Write an enzyme that holds these catalytic residues in place. Sequence first.
Site, short mmCIF file in Angstrom:
data_model
loop_
_atom_site.label_atom_id
_atom_site.label_comp_id
_atom_site.label_asym_id
_atom_site.label_seq_id
_atom_site.Cartn_x
_atom_site.Cartn_y
_atom_site.Cartn_z
CE1 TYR E 43 -2.93 5.51 0.20
CE2 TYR E 43 -2.26 4.30 -1.77
CZ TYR E 43 -2.13 5.39 -0.93
OH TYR E 43 -1.20 6.36 -1.22
CG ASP E 90 2.76 9.18 -3.71
OD1 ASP E 90 2.91 8.77 -2.54
OD2 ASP E 90 1.65 9.53 -4.16
CE1 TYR E 127 -4.46 8.60 -7.76
CE2 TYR E 127 -6.22 9.30 -6.28
CZ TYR E 127 -4.87 9.15 -6.55
OH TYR E 127 -3.93 9.54 -5.62
#
Lengths: 161, 161, 161, 161, 161, 161
Positions: E43, E90, E127
């Site tokens: 990421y 996002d 998460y």
Amino acid sequence: AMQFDVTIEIPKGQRNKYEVDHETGRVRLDRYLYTPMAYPTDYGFIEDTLGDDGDPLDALVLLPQPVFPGVLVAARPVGMFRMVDEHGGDDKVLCVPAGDPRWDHVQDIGDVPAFELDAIKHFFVHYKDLEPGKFVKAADWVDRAEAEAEVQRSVERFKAG
Amino acid sequence: AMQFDVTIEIPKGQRNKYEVDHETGRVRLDRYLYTPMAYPTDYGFIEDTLGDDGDPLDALVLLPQPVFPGVLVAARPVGMFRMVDEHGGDDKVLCVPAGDPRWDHVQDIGDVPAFELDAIKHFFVHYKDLEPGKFVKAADWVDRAEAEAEVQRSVERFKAG
Amino acid sequence: AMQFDVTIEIPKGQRNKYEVDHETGRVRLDRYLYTPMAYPTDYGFIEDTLGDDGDPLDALVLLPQPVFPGVLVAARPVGMFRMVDEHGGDDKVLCVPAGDPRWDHVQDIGDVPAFELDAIKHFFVHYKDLEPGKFVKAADWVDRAEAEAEVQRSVERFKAG
Amino acid sequence: AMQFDVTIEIPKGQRNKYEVDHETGRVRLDRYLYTPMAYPTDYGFIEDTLGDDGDPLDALVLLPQPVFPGVLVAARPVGMFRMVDEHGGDDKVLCVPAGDPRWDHVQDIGDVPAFELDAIKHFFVHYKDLEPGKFVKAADWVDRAEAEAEVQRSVERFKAG
Amino acid sequence: AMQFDVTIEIPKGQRNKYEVDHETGRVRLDRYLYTPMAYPTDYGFIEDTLGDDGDPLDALVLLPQPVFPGVLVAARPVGMFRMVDEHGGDDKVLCVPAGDPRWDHVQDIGDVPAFELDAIKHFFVHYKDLEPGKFVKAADWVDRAEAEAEVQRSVERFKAG
Amino acid sequence: AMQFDVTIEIPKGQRNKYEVDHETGRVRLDRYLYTPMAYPTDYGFIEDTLGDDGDPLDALVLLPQPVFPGVLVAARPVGMFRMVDEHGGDDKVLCVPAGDPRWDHVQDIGDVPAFELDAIKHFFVHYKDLEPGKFVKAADWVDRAEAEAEVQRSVERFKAG
Ligand SMILES: c1ccc(-n2cccc2-c2nc(N3CC3)nc(N3CC3)n2)cc1
Ligand SMILES: c1ccc(-n2cccc2-c2nc(N3CC3)nc(N3CC3)n2)cc1
Ligand SMILES: c1ccc(-n2cccc2-c2nc(N3CC3)nc(N3CC3)n2)cc1
Ligand SMILES: c1ccc(-n2cccc2-c2nc(N3CC3)nc(N3CC3)n2)cc1
Ligand SMILES: c1ccc(-n2cccc2-c2nc(N3CC3)nc(N3CC3)n2)cc1
Ligand SMILES: c1ccc(-n2cccc2-c2nc(N3CC3)nc(N3CC3)n2)cc1
């Protein structure tokens, strides 16, 4: 005695090949190797050098535990691995940590065991076997005097610029 | 569909070569490899088999994450790597995890990419280059039908005893 | 030359201390060490021995890469670390892998560098500093002849039973 | 105080799910998890027990460093995680290492922080979200007295057989 | 074909969440995740971009082996994960390594298996479950054309400044 | 409450000792430790400080998972380890992650368990035992008020310059 700083690009036991962008200083992933081989020693380049191929002079450093990409290590040469590939000349100076008494019995290429030198040779000979249009030839181990000479002139070449 | 249990000896990315003593079932370190190479897949043998060389039939299992030595994995064959070395015949059945829907598109050797098969071939061809009196030859990939046939007769050979 | 199988309990660089239950053969976690220290070599016991303290004879094996708990390694002795602790006598035979030509220049305790022997000594002297009612004393390195003698009689003691 | 041996199947931070075949004692890979989740503690079963679902009673052990699959750990209970899934009842006893003074302030479920218990709950609630026909419900933390009671009767059930 | 450099912040399989301070270029630990989950892919963010939320455009890169925080990777887009959280928009562009023939069969979002896309979705959905006042919604996978469009305008937004 | 950024040089569990060159900001390998010991916590220095010995003020940060060398961590002090070595004064501020509710019960040195403080003390007392002409003395744990005072004046010393 000769001494210099090596910036480690690739830790030992890695199949990822990292480079440094010498303009920015950023670490870059070149590629995941195509053969099932791992780097036999910690691999990097000597700071403030310009080698026989127009890039900085490469260096192999014998470490007891691997480091991370981008880390500096004060090293001294004990020999050099001479080779020619698709780039051109692409020699690697074999080094040990400078100022460490645990490596004091390693002064020249004869002090390094044959099995280790054979293994290092085997990596660079075979790691690009599955990449087309990429070869190596003229693989040869040379002594410290020859290694120190190539470092010396690579510093001269760098200062001219 | 054919299915069997593979006992994994060697995890992927290892330079240690583990064997199992088939009398006791204990894991043993055979040797640290002489070349700078790492095992490209998880490696083991099929339980309750007796192969074409008098030892159990070897197996390569494609796993997303490696396991530990001695662990059982339910596997199904998709092909086989055929080779002859100093032992004699020494074929390895290529497998994927059985009952896992994430591997359902891998049914035969054509479904496995060439780069992976080339890499597996490269390991077994070159990993004993620095060991004297040890070679390999007749390296060849064959399909599932051929793999299933060798498993079938290796189970027959085992039952006879 | 003398040769034996060592069952490795503890890999190198571990802070977990594993034991083997000699009745069952199961690996057990003894404890997480109380000091911030890691095992300097791979640690285990010689199979089919009964040492000077009524437990199997302990062994330190110099490996290039660590193994897992429970793995067998064919080893040969080059020396021994003699020590007395709260158990009583608790000597450790220093070994290298048997039948490996890369360790052929290591034949006796003089061939092992002082820095490594000092480090191994330092671990066993200090690793129980924060555990109350646990000490060590009489820490001493001895040669191969002394090590071979203790192995020999520990096999005799084991056969008597 | 109550004490028992837990055989650890799954180390902490693993995405591989290992089981033990209770007939043979061999470690088996059940599956690589379908969700991007890792086991929050070391996971195993209590030796010589037969739980409320006809399999051995499961146990979560809080360790500072993870162990390998198959390793025994002497543990004591401080609580229990109660849950029902597609199997039926599937409770997990929360434990700490027995005879270790560093865990002496952890005696009951109130001594364990909420963030850790919430995280453990989150794993077991969500790790089978992408497996069809698999759910969990009735997730609830209970105290040590309740945990000790379920261990007690699971030992009774085991002795009857 | 479109190509760009991704600076990897978080390696695959990590529970530490690293950010980059875009003023200095330094890597910072944001936090250890509150849920027992690990990052499913490598990421990072695309260099020289300004996304739809005023921060650089995020990117997921499929790698065979993870890299370290701060490393550059030449990547090409094959799709995008669209989502809205407490920040606002996002989105994450899904990429593969550029100039690598082993990823040539991955050209659009349909070429990526459902199990992998489901797993990536599952991470970002769950998460932050245990962090209060933090959610995500409108989770959706879109094709390469949509991904290339968002990269294009994020470069335009960056050049305006 | 007091808060500052710590640049982590050395991850927890490492035997490599990394430094930062404060002129360039580059990470350097100082040395591989001569004793078989590992760093008990993540170790670094506080940014923009000049301590009682003319170098930046050192810091120990308690983390659940280690980070990489060069990473920034927002931390708050809970105590300090006071010691004098061959350099001179060489105090280390004990910290936890700032803005993390999982560390809210750790406010002063009394909240940290004795076993952890003893272990940290043991490392710094013994890790240079095999290096000649290197010692430590006056090892002492002090409270948060004392730690905050040394941070405060080290920032003042830094601003004067
Ligand atoms: C000569 C040169 C290198 C090696 N060699 C091969 C693998 C590890 C080593 C090694 N490793 C070490 N260190 C730091 C732990 N020291 C040495 N010594 C010169 C005596 N050698 C052995 C002999
Ligand atoms: C065919 C066979 C294997 C691979 N391959 C190469 C490296 C990893 C894989 C792999 N890895 C996976 N898993 C479990 C995560 N799944 C697959 N798939 C059949 C679609 N392939 C890709 C295509
Ligand atoms: C004598 C004995 C041990 C070492 N030593 C210390 C760390 C690693 C080693 C080492 N490691 C190796 N291997 C397998 C890679 N070989 C040797 N050699 C006898 C020449 N030494 C160096 C000299
Ligand atoms: C209560 C129970 C567990 C924890 N906890 C969470 C992560 C690590 C721990 C932990 N870890 C440890 N060890 C062995 C290093 N000890 C404790 N203590 C009871 C005081 N806690 C903290 C408080
Ligand atoms: C399509 C896209 C990704 C995957 N996949 C899932 C896990 C690993 C992979 C993977 N991994 C690889 N490499 C570099 C080893 N290659 C591919 N291939 C397009 C054929 N896939 C499989 C199919
Ligand atoms: C007080 C201070 C530290 C510890 N301790 C020792 C090892 C791990 C920990 C620890 N570890 C954690 N985290 C993040 C997982 N949290 C705490 N807590 C204050 C309650 N402690 C236990 C009690």
